[PDB]
């Protein structure tokens, strides 16, 4: 359990601090496991609205979202699940998401649309900033060139059909460096 715990803490911390973006539904499912872990089996009479310090159970973007009902529902559903079992499930649930282990940046697409741009050792993904759904994915091995200016970042994957991919961001350089270091190994 001491070893299982580290993994759990790591996975939990990334969801909670926002490094690992997840959907509202998922975040609430995670908090349900977290509740089982920290308070044991759900007690309807005490584990009710106002009981949780929400900032300790949900990503910041979902605190003002009235998620306590869904949280306690997920908690109640764990039944008498053990702390160990609850942690393994939490860890695996995080591993099951395509957003897992992805470095995300928040950008604006063409009224502009906020969007989560993710980079990994092998690809670039466009993810809905709200539902956290993978909308599109590119393979890094197909990267041709890129342009990063103080207020934008553009990628060219050599795709004639739709053209280039350009978004508003002040982190263009940060992203370019992540990409350059990764292709140094794959290309």
């Amino acid at each position: 359990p001491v070893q299982l715990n580290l993994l759990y803490v790591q996975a939990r911390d990334d969801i909670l601090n926002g490094s690992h973006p997840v959907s509202f539904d998922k975040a609430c499912e995670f908090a349900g496991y977290q509740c089982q872990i920290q308070f044991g089996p759900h007690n309807e009479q005490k584990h009710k609205p106002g009981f949780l310090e929400l900032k300790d159970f949900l990503p910041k973007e979902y605190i003002k979202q009235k998620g306590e009902r869904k949280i306690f529902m997920a908690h109640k559903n764990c039944g008498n699940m053990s702390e160990i079992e609850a942690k393994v499930r939490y860890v695996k649930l995080a591993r099951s998401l395509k957003t897992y282990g992805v470095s995300f940046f928040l950008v604006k697409e063409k009224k502009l649309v906020p969007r989560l741009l993710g980079i990994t050792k092998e690809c670039v993904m466009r993810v809905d900033e709200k539902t956290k759904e993978v909308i599109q994915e590119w393979s890094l091995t197909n990267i041709k060139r890129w342009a990063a200016s103080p207020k934008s970042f553009t990628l060219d994957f050599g795709d004639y059909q739709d053209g280039y991919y350009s978004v508003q961001t002040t982190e263009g350089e940060q992203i370019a460096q992540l990409i350059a270091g990764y292709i140094d190994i794959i290309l």
């Binding site: 060139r145 342009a147 290309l187």
Partner: peptide
């Protein structure tokens, strides 16, 4: 755009 080539062999070689 002031591009930075990726020097990707797929396109370069």
């Amino acid at each position: 755009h002031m591009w930075d080539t990726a020097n990707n062999p797929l396109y370069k070689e």
